[PDB]
Amino acid sequence: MKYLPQQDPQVFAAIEQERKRQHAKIELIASENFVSRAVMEAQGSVLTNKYAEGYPGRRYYGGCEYVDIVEELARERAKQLFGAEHANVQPHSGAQANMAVYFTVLEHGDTVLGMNLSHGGHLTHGSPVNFSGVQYNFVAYGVDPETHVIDYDDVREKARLHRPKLIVAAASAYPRIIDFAKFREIADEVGAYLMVDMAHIAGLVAAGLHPNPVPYAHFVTTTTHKTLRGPRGGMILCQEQFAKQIDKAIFPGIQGGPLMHVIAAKAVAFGEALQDDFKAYAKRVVDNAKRLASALQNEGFTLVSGGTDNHLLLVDLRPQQLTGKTAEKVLDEVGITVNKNTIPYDPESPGVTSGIRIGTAAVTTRGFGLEEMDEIAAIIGLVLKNVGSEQALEEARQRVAALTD
Amino acid sequence: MKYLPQQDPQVFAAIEQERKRQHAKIELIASENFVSRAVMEAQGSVLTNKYAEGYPGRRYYGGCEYVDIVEELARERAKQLFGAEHANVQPHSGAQANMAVYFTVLEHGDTVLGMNLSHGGHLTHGSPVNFSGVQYNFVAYGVDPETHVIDYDDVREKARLHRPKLIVAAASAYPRIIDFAKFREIADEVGAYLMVDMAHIAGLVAAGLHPNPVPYAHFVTTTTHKTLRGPRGGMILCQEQFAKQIDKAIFPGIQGGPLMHVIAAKAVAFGEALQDDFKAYAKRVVDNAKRLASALQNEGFTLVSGGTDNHLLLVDLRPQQLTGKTAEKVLDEVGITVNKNTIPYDPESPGVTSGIRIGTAAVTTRGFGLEEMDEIAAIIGLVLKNVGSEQALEEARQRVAALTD
Ligand SMILES: *Cc1c(COP(=O)(O)O)cnc(C)c1O
Ligand SMILES: *Cc1c(COP(=O)(O)O)cnc(C)c1O
């Protein structure tokens, strides 16, 4: 940076602390990643100056010839990446992507069936303090109490009983592959639309390491950040038949002017994801997650569903007589960043929890491999088995520092 | 830029075209501006990597110590700038700022009273194709057919007849000062909340050149871009008594993770607006608008309301037997960027219109002054009085080039 340090020392000092923090800590929060310098440069461009309400070649304002090129690059690359017939790259966030799909197919008070929020469903899949649960009548399907895999017979039963207009599949804390074919079969049986929210797994889908929801879902929503490793924002994919309605839902439906600079950054990220090296990266993400899961089990930890098929895992801390909140706090003391997370059938409140959620996307981006996964698991073992020993915590601290340099 | 040119030649080439376009054209679209290099650097920072759902000191995830500093700088600077008791700097856009306020105080189907969309009201103030007009029952007040000033007796009558829960004041195409005291008096009479959407005029309010809605409104919404000259995004201001509800409306109500890098950019912009030179800038904006209005009248143009109190003006093109669409198109041919705009009581559709809207914020940022306003008016006169003369259009083209260099 050149101009910010002189113009705003306060903001610059804080950004610099954050930058240094990102390097020093071991980031295991499953939603986190580190974007490329190219992605950041795109977001820091003069495209923030341009109003471009509407769509490429169909804008309200003149002078959009070049931002049109940018948006089309984003849409076309997204379509090639996911094999979708239509992309809308304007959503400000994953929340707004979902909001737009809901706005497209639902009326106020319509019934929607989504994943139980305590079992892995997202806030925007029917929380009573979120617009989704306030605006629509959400009902929930669960995972099996033993296997922790989605109970597809429960999905089916809930769908048949409640007759939802929309079924939502996808999760923010589900460590196994989701069967989109079964979701579509159930949707078809009850005459419901299927929406898949692939935000967490989008990078894996792009790399062919998780089944693609595009052929099975009427609508696919996602964040551009997370495993896809893009700028912070949202996206909707759908077949040509819903394109006009989806576009109208985003604008003039729920948003105003799009963030053209962020859309440029989206194009950059999609360009990156189309490359062979991203496929290699995504495989290392999944490989690292399996390795970390196995190494954690070696330490004596119990994992929700007994492991992982993707980038994330959930530790059930009940055997160690620890809450997620306690584990989160002590790991923070040694420089390991996790979040407490409700586990399926958690006896604890969302404010306390019986679990921690862990993902490998961020550490993989930093170049961590299998050996580092073993060490991370060993450090977590050292910490959580010795929460009362400042000796042990200092050793963990030094071992964390050794990993990040 | 260093990394984008090598990583993504396609995106870079398009950005470079846009950058060059921004320099070459005379930007008169009233919503447009040019942000500082410091603001852009902040948006292009590593803060995009951080999930920070919640609020400073009350986040869901750990590691937010530094982004907390950034958000607090934004909130505190906003409060000093506007004399507000509370700020929420998380809204992704002006649309989302409004969405959040609506979500806070209204239930589905509640009546809201806003400015007639054909008279200057915004899309998000009740368009039947926008969430506002779909989710809530919007009724409208108008401007006087002759003076084109808001008819406060009409505001009052509509409020008393329809009994709205919420009254919205503020506009995207109103060239005169809005009387927030009268709006609050009417709101008080009918027991309605008052929301002021100051997006267009926020920079002028900050500089003390338009009366401040903060003391009169329960809620003030705004874009951080436009006259305030910040990054693309939104903000809500309110008294302490609504702070908790407003914060909850933004998250977990309507959004997910905030854009921390954009929030950094917001802090930077607010820092800039607090400086004496921004006050001088904003005065030049208003001075330039008056000068341009006067010079356009000298050319024989009729202006809606007979002039301007702010950064923007509306040309009523009926005396020249031109539509807004025609004027917009021909001005585009010579390098002057305006938008067609419905005028009050327009006999034409929104797709055609009888007016063009013009604002001086962008050209003022470029350093244009009174002499340039005279020349801009003269060029517009030359063009619109000679739409059929390629000679005249080429002369205009050369005169536009002379202004931008
Ligand atoms: C992260 C996420 C979201 C929300 O994205 P934001 O950008 O935080 O609004 C929605 N759905 C799922 C499944 C997610 O993982
Ligand atoms: C520009 C504007 C908006 C919308 O802002 P976006 O950032 O485009 O969503 C809302 N209200 C008013 C009065 C505006 O001027």
Q: What is the CATH number of the domain that holds A223?
A: 3.40.640.10
B95 near A CB under 8 A: yes
d(CA B262, CA B259): 5
Number of structural domains chain B divides into: 2
Pairing of strands A312-316, A355-359: antiparallel
Residue with tokens 């950054």: A265
d(CA A301, CA A324): 13
Pairing of strands A166-169, A193-197: parallel
Question: Of B233, B249, B283, which one is at a domain's C-terminal end?
Answer: B283
Q: Is the minimum distance from the CB of B31 to ligand 2 under 6 angstroms?
A: yes
Task: Give, as one character, the DSSP assignment of residue B351.
Answer: T
A295 close to A69: Cβ distance less than 8 angstroms: no
Q: Do B70 and A11 touch (CB under 8 A)?
A: yes
d(CA A141, CA A115): 5
Facing B63 at nearest CB: one of A25, A103, A271: A25
Report, as residue numbers or ranges, the catalytic residues of A. 51, 53, 197, 223, 226, 232
In 3-state terms chain B splits into helix, strand, coil percentages (rounded to 5) of 50, 15, 35
User: What's the order of all strands across the beta sheet hosting B234-238?
Assistant: B86-88, B234-238, B219-223, B193-197, B166-169, B111-115, B137-141
Q: Do A3 and B70 touch (CB under 8 A)?
A: no
Name the nearest CA neighbour of B53 among B71, B39, B31: B71
User: What's the order of all strands across the beta sheet hosting A339-341?
Assistant: A302-303, A312-316, A355-359, A339-341
Q: Which of residues 139-178 of B touch A (CB under 8 A)?
A: none
d(CA B344, CA B142): 8
For A388-394, the CB contacts below 8 A with 24+ separation are A393/A330, A393/A333, A393/A334
d(CA A156, CA A141): 9
Q: Which residues in B lie closer than 8 A to residue A253 (C-beta atoms)?
A: 129-131
Task: Spell out the residues 6+ positions from residue B61 whose beta carbon is closer than 8 angstroms to its own.
Answer: A29, A337, A339, B51, B52, B53, B54
Q: Which two tokens stand for residue B227?
A: 């006259």
Q: Which two tokens stand for residue A264?
A: 């440029």
Q: Which two tokens stand for residue B113?
A: 């009273």
d(CA A18, CA A52): 32
Q: Please indicate, yes or no, whether residues A300 and A368 belong to a single structural domain of this protein.
A: yes
Nearest CA of chain A to the CA of B233: how many Å?
9
Q: Please indicate, yes or no, whether residues B249 and B326 belong to a single structural domain of this protein.
A: no
Q: Please indicate, yes or no, whether residues B202 and B223 belong to a single structural domain of this protein.
A: yes
B-chain residue closest to A12, CA distance:
B42
Helix (H, G, I), strand (E, B), or coil: what is residue B259? coil
d(CA B249, CA A213): 31
Q: Which of residues 213-242 of B touch A (CB under 8 A)?
A: 225, 231-232
Q: Which of residues 9-68 of B touch A (CB under 8 A)?
A: 10-11, 14-15, 17-19, 21-22, 25, 27, 29, 31-51, 60-63, 65-67
Q: Three-state SS across chain A? A: CCCHHHHCHHHHHHHHHHHHHHHHCEECCCCCCCCCHHHHHHHCCHHHHCCCCEECCEECCCCCHHHHHHHHHHHHHHHHHHCCCEEECCCCCHHHHHHHHHHHHCCCCCEEEEECHHHCCCCCCCCCCCHHHHHCEEEEECECCCCCCECHHHHHHHHHHHCCCEEEECCCCCCCCCCHHHHHHHHHHHCCEEEEECHHHHHHHHCCCCCCCCCCCCEEEEECCCCCCCCCCEEEEECHHHHHHHHHHHHHHHCCCCCHHHHHHHHHHHHHHCCHHHHHHHHHHHHHHHHHHHHHHHCCCEEHHHCCCCCEEEEECHHHCCCHHHHHHHHHHHCEECEEECCCCCCCCCCCCCEEEEECHHHHHCCCCHHHHHHHHHHHHHHHCCCCCHHHHHHHHHHHHHHHC
Phi-psi region of B169 (alpha: psi -120 to 50; beta: other; left: phi over 0): beta
Which structural technique was applied? X-ray
Q: CA B189, B191, B194: angle at the middle one, nearest 5?
A: 95
Helices (DSSP H) in B125-259: which residue ranges?
A: 131-135, 152-162, 180-190, 202-206, 240-248
Distance B32 CA to ligand 2 centre (A): 11
Question: Of B267, B283, B299, which one is at a domain's C-terminal end?
Answer: B283
Q: Please indicate, yes or no, whether residues B302 and B372 belong to a single structural domain of this protein.
A: yes
For B296-300, the CB contacts below 8 A with 24+ separation are B296/B377, B296/B380, B296/B381, B298/B377, B299/B377, B299/B378, B299/B380, B299/B381, B299/B385, B300/B381, B300/B385
A222 close to A202: Cβ distance less than 8 angstroms: yes
Q: Please indicate, yes or no, whether residues B9 and B39 belong to a single structural domain of this protein.
A: no
A322 close to A359: Cβ distance less than 8 angstroms: no
Q: Which two tokens stand for residue B231?
A: 């990054």
B111 catalytic? Reply is: no
Q: Please indicate, yes or no, whether residues A145 and A279 belong to a single structural domain of this protein.
A: yes
Q: Which of residues 318-337 of B touch A (CB under 8 A)?
A: 328, 332, 337
For chain A, how many residues are written? 405
Question: Could you write out the DSSP letters of every residue in B72-87?
Answer: HHHHHHHHHHHT-SEE
Resolution (A): 1.7
d(CA A328, CA A324): 6
Facing A14 at nearest CB: one of B3, B36, B66: B66
**Residues in a beta bridge with A113:** A139, A167
Between the alpha carbon of residue A372 and those of residues A291, A295, A366, A405, B24, the distances in Å are 10, 10, 11, 13, 53
Facing A123 at nearest CB: one of B94, B232, B256: B256
Angle between helices B65-82 and A9-24 (to 10 degrees): 160
d(CA B340, CA B315): 10
Q: CA B194, B197, B203: angle at the middle one, nearest 5?
A: 130
d(CA B188, CA B191): 5
Q: Please provide residue A391's backbone torsions phi and psi, each rounded to the nearest 5 degrees.
A: -55, -55
Q: Do A46 and B103 touch (CB under 8 A)?
A: no
Q: Is the minimum distance from the CB of B124 to ligand 2 under 6 angstroms?
A: yes
Amino acid at B287: D
Amino acid at A94: G
Task: Give, as one character, the DSSP assignment of residue B275.
Answer: S
Element (H, E) at B66: helix B65-82
Q: Is the minimum distance from the CB of B172 to ligand 2 under 6 angstroms?
A: yes
Looking at the CA of residue B233, tell me the nearest atom of ligand 2: 7
Name the nearest CA neighbour of A110 among A133, A129, A142: A133
Q: Three-state SS across B102-144? A: HHHHCCCCCEEEEECHHHCCCCCCCCCCCHHHHHCEEEEECEC
Task: Give, as one character, the DSSP assignment of residue B56.
Answer: T
Dihedral Cα A89, A94, A100, A103, nearest 10 deg: 170
Q: Which of residues 237-266 of B touch A (CB under 8 A)?
A: 248, 252-257, 259, 261, 264
Q: Is the minimum distance from the CB of B94 to ligand 2 under 6 angstroms?
A: yes
For B398-401, the CB contacts below 8 A with 24+ separation are B399/B375, B400/B25, B400/B26, B400/B334, B400/B335, B400/B336, B401/B24, B401/B335
Name the nearest CA neighbour of B327 among B396, B305, B336: B336
Respond yes or no on whether the N-terminal peptide bond of residue B231 is cis (omega within 30° of 0).
no
Q: Which of A46, A102, A224, A356 to mutate to test the interface with B (most CBs of B within 10 A)?
A: A46
Shortest-distance ligand to the CA of residue B102: 2
Q: Which residues in A lie closer than 8 A to residue B22 (C-beta atoms)?
A: 46, 49-50
Task: Spell out the residues 6+ positions from residue B144 whose beta carbon is closer than 8 angstroms to its own.
Answer: B150, B151
Q: Do B93 and A44 touch (CB under 8 A)?
A: no
d(CA B6, CA B342): 45
Question: Of A252, A283, A314, which one is at a domain's C-terminal end?
Answer: A283
Q: Do A70 and B108 touch (CB under 8 A)?
A: no
CATH of the domain at B8: 3.90.1150.10
d(CA B54, CA B64): 10
Residue B2 structural domain:
1-32+284-405
Residue B181: other Cβ atoms inside 10 A: 12
Q: Please indicate, yes or no, whether residues A154 and A244 belong to a single structural domain of this protein.
A: yes
Among protein residues, the one with the nearest Cα to ligand 2's atom 3 is B94
Distance B320 CA to ligand 1 centre (A): 52
Q: Which two tokens stand for residue B253?
A: 């109500």
Helix (H, G, I), strand (E, B), or coil: what is residue B31? coil
B223 catalytic? Reply is: yes
Facing A11 at nearest CB: one of B123, B268, B328: B268
Task: Give, as one character, the DSSP assignment of residue B335.
Answer: T
Amino acid at B74: A
Amino acid at B86: H
> What is the gyration radius of the CA atoms in chain A, in angstroms?
22
Q: Please indicate, yes or no, whether residues B339 and B360 belong to a single structural domain of this protein.
A: yes
Q: Is the minimum distance from the CB of A94 to ligand 1 under 6 angstroms?
A: yes
Amino acid at A175: P
B226 catalytic? Reply is: yes
Q: Do B268 and A4 touch (CB under 8 A)?
A: yes
Among protein residues, the one with the nearest Cα to ligand 1's atom 12 is A199
Distance B388 CA to ligand 1 centre (A): 53
Respond yes or no on whether the N-terminal peptide bond of residue B91 is cis (omega within 30° of 0).
no
Looking at the CA of residue B200, tell me the nearest atom of ligand 2: 15
Q: Please provide residue B55's backbone torsions phi and psi, each rounded to the nearest 5 degrees.
A: -135, 165
Dihedral Cα B346, B348, B350, B352, nearest 10 deg: -130
A90 close to A267: Cβ distance less than 8 angstroms: no
Q: Is the minimum distance from the CB of B316 to ligand 2 under 6 angstroms?
A: no
Q: Which two tokens stand for residue A274?
A: 């189309």
A405 near B CB under 8 A: no
Residue A297: other Cβ atoms inside 10 A: 16
**Residues in a beta bridge with A27:** A337
First-to-final CA distance of chain A: 24
Helix (H, G, I), strand (E, B), or coil: what is residue B195? strand
Among protein residues, the one with the nearest Cα to ligand 2's atom 12 is B199
Distance B219 CA to ligand 1 centre (A): 28
A397 close to A335: Cβ distance less than 8 angstroms: yes
Q: Do A3 and B41 touch (CB under 8 A)?
A: yes
Q: Do B73 and A10 touch (CB under 8 A)?
A: yes
Q: Please indicate, yes or no, whether residues A387 and A332 belong to a single structural domain of this protein.
A: yes
d(CA A171, CA A121): 5
Neighbour-count burial for B98-137, b at 16+ CB within 10 Å, e otherwise? bbbbbbbbbeeeebbbbbbbbbbbbbbbbbeebbbbbbbb
Q: Is the minimum distance from the CB of A124 to ligand 1 under 6 angstroms?
A: yes
**Residues in a beta bridge with A112:** A138, A166
Q: How many CB pairs under 8 A join A and B?
A: 271
Angle between helices A276-298 and A370-384 (to 10 degrees): 30
Nearest CA of chain B to the CA of A372: how many Å?
21
For B51-56, the CB contacts below 8 A with 24+ separation are B51/A29, B51/A31, B51/A32, B51/B257, B52/B257, B52/B258, B52/B260, B53/B251, B53/B252, B53/B256, B53/B257, B53/B258, B54/B251, B55/B247, B55/B251
Q: Please indicate, yes or no, whether residues A47 and A117 belong to a single structural domain of this protein.
A: yes
d(CA A155, CA A133): 18
Q: Please indicate, yes or no, whether residues B110 and B2 belong to a single structural domain of this protein.
A: no
Element (H, E) at B377: helix B370-384
d(CA A154, CA A128): 22
Element (H, E) at B194: strand B193-197
Q: Please indicate, yes or no, whether residues B191 and B220 belong to a single structural domain of this protein.
A: yes
Distance A231 CA to ligand 1 centre (A): 13
Helices (DSSP H) in B299-338: which residue ranges?
A: 324-334
CB-side neighbour CA atoms (13 Å) of A46: 17
Residue B391: other Cβ atoms inside 10 A: 9
Facing B256 at nearest CB: one of A14, A124, A253: A124
d(CA B268, CA B231): 9
Burial class (CB in 10 A: 0-12, 13-18, 19+), B65: middle
Burial class (CB in 10 A: 0-12, 13-18, 19+), B378: middle
